[PDB]
Design a protein around this nucleic acid. Structure first.
Length: 801
RNA sequence: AAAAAAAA
């Protein structure tokens, strides 16, 4: 129903000196008057609203405004430093004619805000916070071009991104609060837009078919679907009508040529009879806009693209790679650019801020974090062979697994053409796999019992059925995939839903180019696919909460992309099954699209508790939850619903059963970066902060429990720390204890020998959600649950890893 | 789809 308060400040670690991109802001403790402005029609854009409001202010001055400069957010609200003498009642004033109206609702004040920030007891007034945020943005909004919360200047785009896409630089601004002061958040950001060239070469570029004169066919008849799905949803800028601005979204496009295009006389004939103009390319198709009764047509040769449109659809791998390469940069360059932008902004010579009386600083804020110690890991075999991570990475050479799994029966399915793998590469592959496995842990034995070529994506089920029927005690199958065929999806579906056998996939390139690191990683995957154990945390160095049985949970919600068909959203929950947290299970299921609530939480938690009891013979006393992917400003309703669902699930299983519950939400999509103050303590070529640095003061909320943590070693660009925010606490933990527990849980990932960003439950929930998304891809609410349900023989293993 | 990080 509420949130806890901070039980002190942690005092374990080694001090560090950092810098954060927060600039202080001062307030004058006055009273500001709140007004409401509404203009019809309601479909007018924000730029036009601002223009008409400014015109009314400037040229209807003596009637209303006397020597006063208001601030307008953009949609409905305006503010003024002094009371407007128009009156307290709803007084309305007055294409080329617009109508406005005035109100007086909710006069706000700032002394209460200052008192709340100086003494952490009462919550911060969102009305005052929004007033300051609106007053701190007016000149930038008026001058620059606003794209969401970005302020990209109109000078300099460059960096073509491939097919009809570009990258625009800018910055992002916010007035997030802090302790004793308000602070301004500045950060460099980049986005993607559409280049504004004529549509003929736009299509030529997107199809890479510039040499089309050699093949003047009316249509390709193979990529027309993708061309239509690309062009659809964009606004045109035809200028043949005299800057008429036919801003009609192109819903439908025909494919017949202008020669065969008939409507009550073709486009060429109508254009001739109207303007006496000849069309150079008649064999091209035509664009259709408006209603069918209107039948307004547009030939492709006299059309353009409007500048200033965002992209929502998916991208391509090479486009993503080149975007990352273009916008990578590094920490010193980022710091220099941030400082240059802040010094160039010159917020102290602005008429509006001068009128209100706000003052802003010039230098970055100083913070003092600390570095937590790293744990140690226990291996098995002939000798213990403990491992000590160094700079977030350790190695496995010379050590054996904790619990090996001998392999006796296995098969191999080839696929791919015989040219790239015929007889020689496979022998070396098998021999090196056997040697590496014998060196490390599981001793693969014998010769493969099956090795055949099965080209064709429709010949998977009969082959797997024959293998299962013929070879008793099958234990593993190896698959080789040529490219990006749907064979991967078909194999996953067949081996998880229908039959229930373990499978492993690998590329041809890594088979014709062997490598010890690749082979070791593949063995790491295979060992836990079969049901073994890789390593466990050393029991001596561990938290004090493990003295009694506990269970760790996690959750995630995945939403459909763009605005395509109403495919269902997917939610998932995972939980541990061992005293040392090394094994997990998943209970994915679907729900109504576009909703940020898990509805079946009670059933999921009841099932997980039943499985935990069946596997451990005990009953959990504490529960730890790690929710991921919560939009800001929608937390209290989510907390209420889930906290009630968890308690109901606990109640229904057994009467008078009530364990403790801890609720934690993680956030990785924000705009806070921490840089290193000294030049003698930069780790790596990119000069990032070391791994395991936490900050808890001077940039965090006054009377709530939260912190920052960076638990991975950056390798490219600049790092991005994660923000944790507890909501409900019932086990009365402590700050250092909880931070150490999270840091230790970051080390349990099983697919690599490196520490990672967010905990293993969060990764596992995301992975099972993505696997379910692959499961749903086939080529009806009743059949969706059956499609997502996985086989009983594989419900118990870690098939997602 | 050997694996982590970096941009939306």
């Amino acid at each position: 129903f509420q949130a806890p308060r901070r039980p002190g400040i942690g005092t374990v670690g080694k001090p560090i000196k950092l810098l954060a991109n927060y600039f202080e802001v001062d307030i004058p403790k006055i009273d500001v008057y709140h007004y409401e402005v509404d203009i019809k029609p309601d479909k007018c854009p924000r730029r036009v609203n601002r223009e008409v409001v400014e015109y009314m202010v400037q040229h209807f001055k003596p009637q209303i405004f006397g020597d006063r400069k208001p601030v307008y957010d953009g949609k409905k609200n305006i503010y003024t430093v002094t009371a407007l003498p128009i009156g307290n009642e709803r007084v309305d004033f007055e294409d080329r004619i617009f109508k406005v109206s005035i109100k007086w609702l909710a006069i706000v004040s700032w002394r209460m805000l200052h008192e709340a920030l100086v003494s952490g007891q009462i919550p911060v007034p969102l009305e005052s916070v929004q007033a300051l945020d609106v007053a701190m943005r007016h000149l930038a909004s008026m001058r620059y071009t606003p794209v969401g919360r970005s302020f990209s200047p109109p000078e300099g785009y460059y960096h073509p991104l491939g097919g009809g896409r570009e990258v625009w630089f800018g910055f992002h601004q916010s007035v997030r609060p802090a302790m004793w002061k308000m602070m301004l958040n500045i950060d460099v950001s980049a986005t993607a837009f559409y280049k504004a060239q004529p549509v003929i070469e736009f299509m030529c570029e997107v199809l890479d078919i510039r040499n089309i004169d050699e093949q003047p066919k009316p249509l390709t008849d193979s990529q027309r679907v993708r061309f239509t799905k690309e062009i659809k949803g964009l606004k045109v800028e035809v200028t043949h009508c005299g800057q008429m601005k036919r801003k009609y979204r192109v819903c439908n496009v025909t494919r017949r040529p202008a020669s065969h295009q008939t409507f009550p006389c073709t486009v060429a004939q109508y254009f001739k009879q109207k303007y006496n103009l000849q069309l150079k390319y008649p064999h091209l198709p035509c664009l259709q806009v408006g209603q069918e009764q209107k039948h307004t047509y547009l030939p492709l040769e006299v059309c353009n693209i409007v500048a200033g449109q965002r992209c929502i659809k998916k991208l391509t791998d090479n486009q993503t790679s080149t975007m990352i390469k273009a916008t990578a940069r590094s920490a010193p360059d980022r710091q220099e650019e941030i400082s240059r932008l802040m010094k160039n902004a010159s917020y102290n010579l602005d008429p509006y801020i001068q009128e209100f009386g706000i003052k802003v600083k010039d230098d970055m804020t100083e913070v003092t974090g600390r570095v937590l110690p790293a744990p140690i890991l226990q291996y098995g075999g002939r000798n213990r062979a403990i491992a000590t991570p160094n700079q977030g990475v350790w190695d496995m050479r010379g050590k054996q697994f904790y619990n090996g799994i001998e392999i006796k029966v296995w098969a191999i399915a080839c696929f791919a053409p015989q040219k790239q793998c015929r007889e020689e590469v496979l022998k070396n592959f098998t021999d090196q796999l056997r040697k590496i496995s014998k060196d490390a842990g599981m001793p693969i034995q014998g010769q493969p019992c099956f090795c055949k070529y099965a080209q064709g994506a429709d010949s998977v089920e009969p082959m797997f059925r024959h293998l299962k029927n013929t070879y008793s005690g099958l234990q593993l199958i190896i698959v080789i995939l040529p490219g990006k065929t749907p064979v991967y999806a078909e194999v996953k579906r067949v081996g998880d839903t229908l039959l229930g056998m373990a499978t492993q996939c690998v590329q041809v390139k890594n088979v014709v180019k062997t490598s010890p690191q690749t082979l070791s990683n593949l063995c790491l995957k295979i060992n836990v696919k079969l049901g073994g154990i890789n390593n466990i945390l050393v029991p001596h160095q561990r938290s004090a909460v493990f003295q009694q049985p506990v269970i760790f949970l996690g959750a995630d919600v995945t939403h459909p992309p763009a605005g395509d068909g109403k495919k269902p959203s997917i939610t998932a929950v995972v939980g541990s099954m061992d005293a040392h947290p090394s094994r997990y299970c998943a209970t994915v299921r679907v729900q109504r699209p576009r909703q940020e609530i898990i509805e079946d939480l009670s059933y999921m938690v009841r099932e997980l508790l039943i499985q935990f009891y069946k596997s451990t013979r005990f009953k959990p006393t504490r529960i730890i939850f790690y929710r991921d992917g919560v939009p800001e400003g929608q937390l209290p309703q989510i907390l209420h619903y889930e906290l009630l669902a968890i308690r109901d699930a606990c109640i229904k299983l057994e009467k008078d059963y009530q364990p403790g519950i801890t609720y934690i939400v993680v956030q990785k999509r924000h705009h806070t970066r921490l840089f290193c103050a000294d030049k003698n303590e930069r780790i790596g070529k990119s000069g990032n902060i070391p791994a395991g640095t936490t900050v808890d003061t001077n940039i965090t909320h006054p009377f709530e429990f939260d912190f920052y943590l960076c638990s991975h070693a950056g390798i490219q660009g600049t790092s991005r720390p994660s923000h944790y925010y507890v909501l409900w606490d019932d086990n009365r933990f402590t700050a250092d204890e909880l931070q150490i527990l999270t840091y230790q849980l970051c080390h349990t990932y099983v697919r690599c020998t490196r520490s990672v960003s967010i905990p293993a439950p969060a990764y596992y929930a995301r992975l099972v959600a993505f696997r379910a998304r692959y499961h749903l891809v086939d080529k009806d609410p009743q059949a969706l649950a059956k499609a997502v349900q996985v086989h009983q023989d594989t419900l118990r293993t870690m098939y997602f890893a």
